[PDB]
Amino acid sequence: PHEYEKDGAKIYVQSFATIRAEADLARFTPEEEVVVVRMIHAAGMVGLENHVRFAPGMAIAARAALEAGAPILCDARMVSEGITRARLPAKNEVICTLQDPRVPALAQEMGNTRSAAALELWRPKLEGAVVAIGNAPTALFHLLNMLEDPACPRPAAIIGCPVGFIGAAESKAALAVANPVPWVIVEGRLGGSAITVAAVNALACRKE
Amino acid sequence: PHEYEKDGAKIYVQSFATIRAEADLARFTPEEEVVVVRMIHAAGMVGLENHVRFAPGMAIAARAALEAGAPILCDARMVSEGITRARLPAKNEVICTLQDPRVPALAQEMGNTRSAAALELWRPKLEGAVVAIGNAPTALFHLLNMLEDPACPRPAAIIGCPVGFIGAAESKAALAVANPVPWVIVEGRLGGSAITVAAVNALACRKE
Ligand SMILES: C/C1=C2N=C(/C=C3\N[C@H]([C@@H](C)C4=N[C@H]([C@H](CC(=O)O)[C@@]4(C)CCC(=O)O)[C@]4(C)N=C1[C@@H](CCC(=O)O)[C@]4(C)CC(=O)O)[C@H](CCC(=O)O)C3(C)C)[C@@H](CCC(=O)O)[C@]/2(C)CC(=O)O
Ligand SMILES: C/C1=C2N=C(/C=C3\N[C@H]([C@@H](C)C4=N[C@H]([C@H](CC(=O)O)[C@@]4(C)CCC(=O)O)[C@]4(C)N=C1[C@@H](CCC(=O)O)[C@]4(C)CC(=O)O)[C@H](CCC(=O)O)C3(C)C)[C@@H](CCC(=O)O)[C@]/2(C)CC(=O)O
């Protein structure tokens, strides 16, 4: 038969050790470094770290929000279903409103994507939340517009890592410029659900 | 406010057109090319195509299985929850057994990961299925071992795209060598849920 390593705890330890041996991680603070390592792990891509940018204090602020019970607001089910419930420190709600039955009509009325329209339903959970956007650039752009209204509840942190060729790089660059609340991005076209979930999972639990 | 493109249908068309303008896709058959384009789209990574390998006729065989109602067996919820139900041609079941309450004890008895142990529960749905492994190399390795028994039901196709530093590259190289049923892999460390879902979504529906 095929031989392979079967101890999952060991696999993790070896994965992170390989990443730290290969990656260029010196510029990150200790709190940022843990997040970056998990993002690399999720992507299978040493070199990803050359594209990661954090607002000063974001990693600290996001961990603190999660430990205080902040909900995690997710743009897609691939993000929400990714989050490791066993790693959550304070029974944190993991929310994705994309499949709410009101979203298709709302999107049509708004002249926007379903991904973006769904964020309107985040309002009651948004104050102090950790936002995890791993897919839709239109969700990130729309969030920036929502937060231009001083009446809008404001999250504790935004993990802004949508992926793609159209609008993704722009949405993340705009997030960094706007600096609405502490943020992390992957600059450029790279990003996605797995990198986003890794960031959340890293910030949720002090144990790697 | 921030200006951005909000027409999702248009965004797709532009994304695929950008990918085809930049990517090196000549060696793929028409059926393979559609799959590769969607994988690039999901990864935000022109250059991914340099790592993609198909068994001859896999893309044709997998589309045919799906159109015939084959279930899709998924190693993780980030894969199963990714699959676009609106794109499925024949009311195909999308299955992930990872969270079955019997898996933790089974994994312990088997001395294996939960990801791998869960595949034992695939047996009743495995014959003629499309397998979508986007995460766990141990799931792919274990599947290869399962299929070494002539009594094991055999899938119609395997999308073998686990990601990572430990065991991933090895598991996919082993799949290609073993050639148990028609396969697609991303060679090396790259892969993951998003690329895997993209492959399924591409093969499910003739419309991009
Ligand atoms: C499945 C899926 C996937 N998308 C991916 C990536 C991209 N697609 C975007 C556009 C094409 C787009 N995609 C639809 C939007 C549907 C909508 O919101 O109206 C919208 C049409 C619009 C969103 C937007 O552009 O902001 C949604 C969000 N993508 C989904 C569903 C997620 C559903 C859920 O999670 O509950 C979705 C809601 C469609 C659906 O299934 O109903 C991006 C646009 C940028 C670009 O195209 O270059 C980008 C590249 C990010 C891969 C995943 C990436 C990952 O997880 O890491 C992939 C798996 C690829 C695929 O289609 O097979
Ligand atoms: C969330 C999550 C994530 N994994 C990723 C990637 C990897 N991790 C592997 C090892 C570390 C591993 N990971 C656990 C296994 C738990 C298990 O099955 O016992 C096992 C421990 C073992 C699986 C295996 O090695 O075959 C599982 C599968 N990963 C999950 C849960 C998926 C649960 C579900 O889907 O229902 C999981 C079941 C743990 C859990 O949450 O309970 C790989 C090993 C190779 C390596 O480490 O370099 C590899 C890199 C692939 C990212 C996703 C990648 C993607 O979607 O594209 C990320 C998001 C990273 C993260 O942990 O934040």
The CATH number for A128's domain is 3.40.50.10230
What single DSSP character describes residue B84? -
B146 CB neighbour count, 10 Å cutoff: 20
CB contact, 8 Å: B119 with chain A?
A: no
Element (H, E) at B52: strand B52-54
DSSP character string of chain A? -------HHHHHHHHHHHHHHHS--TTS-HHHHHHHHHHHHHHT-TTGGGGEEE-TTHHHHHHHHHHTT--EEESSHHHHTTS-GGG-SS---EE--TT-TTHHHHHHHHTS-HHHHHGGGGHHHHTTPEEEE-S-HHHHHHHHHHHTSTTS---SEEEE---SSSSHHHHHHHHHHH--S-EEEE-SS---HHHHHHHHHHHH-S--
Tokens of B34: 């559609």
Technique employed here was X-ray
Domain count, chain A: 1
CB contact, 8 Å: B160 with chain A?
A: no
Instruction: Tell me what percent of chain B is helix, strand and coil, each rounded to the nearest 5.
Output: 50, 10, 40
Contact yes or no for A203/A62 (Cβ under 8 A): yes
Residue numbers of the domain that contains A193: 1-208
Tokens of A177: 């410029």
* A2 catalytic residue (yes or no): no
Alpha-carbon gap: B6 to the closest alpha carbon of chain A (Å): 5
What single DSSP character describes residue B25? -
Chain A residues 36-95 with CB within 8 Å of chain B: 41-45, 77-78, 81-82
Q: Please give the resolution of this entry in Å, rounded to 1 decimal.
A: 1.7
Rounded to whole angstroms, the Cα distance separating A135 from A74 reads 9
Contact B18 A44 (CB under 8 A): no
* A116 phi and psi angles, rounded to 5 deg: -75, -45
A127 CB neighbour count, 10 Å cutoff: 13
B10 CB neighbour count, 10 Å cutoff: 11
CA torsion through residues A96, A98, A100, A106, sign: positive
- B166-181 as b/e: b if 16+ CB within 10 A: bbbbbbbebbeebebb
